[PDB]
Amino acid sequence: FVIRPATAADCSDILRLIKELARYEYMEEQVILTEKDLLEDGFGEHPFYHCLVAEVPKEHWTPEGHSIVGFAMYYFTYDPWIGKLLYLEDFFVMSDYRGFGIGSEILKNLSQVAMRCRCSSMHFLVAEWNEPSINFYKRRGASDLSSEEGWRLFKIDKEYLLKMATEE
Amino acid sequence: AKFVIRPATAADCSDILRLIKELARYEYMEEQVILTEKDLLEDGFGEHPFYHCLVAEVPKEHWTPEGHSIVGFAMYYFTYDPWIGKLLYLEDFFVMSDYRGFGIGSEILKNLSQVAMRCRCSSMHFLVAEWNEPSINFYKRRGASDLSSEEGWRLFKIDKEYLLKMATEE
Ligand SMILES: CC(C)(COP(=O)(O)OP(=O)(O)OC[C@H]1O[C@@H](n2cnc3c(N)ncnc32)[C@H](O)[C@@H]1OP(=O)(O)O)[C@@H](O)C(=O)NCCC(=O)NCCS
Ligand SMILES: CC(C)(COP(=O)(O)OP(=O)(O)OC[C@H]1O[C@@H](n2cnc3c(N)ncnc32)[C@H](O)[C@@H]1OP(=O)(O)O)[C@H](O)C(=O)NCCC(=O)NCCS
Ligand SMILES: CCCNCCCNCCCNCC
């Protein structure tokens, strides 16, 4: 299997995997990304995010001939204490293709991206009950900032943003 | 005091760092701030800005004892969630002591909301410490919800030493 950055033609496989991940996260119905959106936002242009894909050789392709069986979606963020961070938005490997070392390779490529772009850390979210992934990351030196430093992710949706924008 | 909210320019980096430190100092973390003016300059004003920043400026008569015209700020950037949409991410939000309670913060949140509407953002995301109840309510009063607890999400990090190990492994 080889890990490489995506191509505009990797778009349909990417959407497919994003949906498999959403499903895994019970978020499938809320997926709002389209191939059109992916092509515009992910490509070369002013690119909003970046994707990596893992593809296996013929002998292990999917019943549907898909060779792309994994992916990672990321972007850069900023921390006032240490600066530029690499933020991992999505990371997924098809069920039958896990434990092969594929995910490890993606994390390796992501680390090099991080070193090359001078990022001081990599941040990402993990579901409370996702034991397998919680360990996979911890085995590679990750710490749970929500436990250690008590951070909780908060959100203010559009209707309230609109209220504040117009309140004046 | 009278104040104006505006975008930070290359010219304002020493004040950005200064306020970052005041925020850190306000949280007894000032020594942790490794960031330099050089970084803020290269990272925020080159071709691809990695953060955006609105600052609050005051007239010469209300300068800080050290003679400074910026008393608050907000650092942010845009992120994306495939099952949410494009997002405005508020990294830091802070106003100096002798300048709070005068509408500075409200104004900043108002302009950030307009920026969000301009960029077609589905929502604004930010972190709050679990024990900071006053802050938690300030945001809840504005329609915020604790996504970490409601949906079961935990923030993780892998620091540089481990990223370097994996980047160079074997
Ligand atoms: C997290 C995820 C992306 C990782 O990818 P992956 O391809 O399974 O990862 P790997 O194959 O490198 O590692 C699998 C494991 O088996 C072991 N392993 C991997 N390759 C091995 C090999 N060649 N020989 C022996 N053991 C191996 C690894 O040590 C690891 O075990 P450990 O967790 O006890 O350390 C993923 O398993 C999957 O997509 N699952 C769920 C969705 C999810 O939780 N996504 C992530 C983010 S919140
Ligand atoms: C939140 C922060 C940016 C506010 O900006 P600000 O310029 O003082 O605020 P505004 O004058 O525009 O008034 C904002 C309002 O914030 C609160 N506020 C005003 N002055 C305040 C002060 N001196 N101390 C604490 N809260 C204050 C008011 O209660 C009101 O909040 P409410 O609408 O929920 O009732 C602020 O002082 C700061 O820099 N914050 C960090 C932490 C903190 O004390 N947090 C908590 C929440 S109330
Ligand atoms: C209101 C409905 C839900 N809104 C959002 C869920 C929030 N955080 C999502 C995910 C990211 N990263 C995976 C590794």
Swiss-Prot record, chain A:
Name of the featured protein: Diamine acetyltransferase 1
Species whose genome carries this gene: Homo sapiens
Family annotation (PANTHER family): DIAMINE ACETYLTRANSFERASE 1, DIAMINE N-ACETYLTRANSFERASE
CDD domains: NAT_SF
InterPro entries assigned: Acyl_CoA_acyltransferase, Diverse_Substrate_AcTransf, GNAT_dom
Annotated positions binding substrate: Y24, E25, E89, H123, F124, L125, E149
EC number of the protein: 2.3.1.57
Described purpose of this protein according to its UniProt entry: Enzyme which catalyzes the acetylation of polyamines. Substrate specificity: norspermidine = spermidine >> spermine > N(1)-acetylspermine. This highly regulated enzyme allows a fine attenuation of the intracellular concentration of polyamines. Also involved in the regulation of polyamine transport out of cells. Also acts on 1,3-diaminopropane and 1,5-diaminopentane.
Single GO BP term: angiogenesis
Key words, A-Z: Acyltransferase, Cytoplasm, Transferase
Noted pH dependence of activity: Optimum pH is 8.0.
Active-site residues, record numbering mapped to chain: Y137 (proton donor)
Quaternary assembly: Homodimer.
Compartments it resides in: Cytoplasm, Cytosol
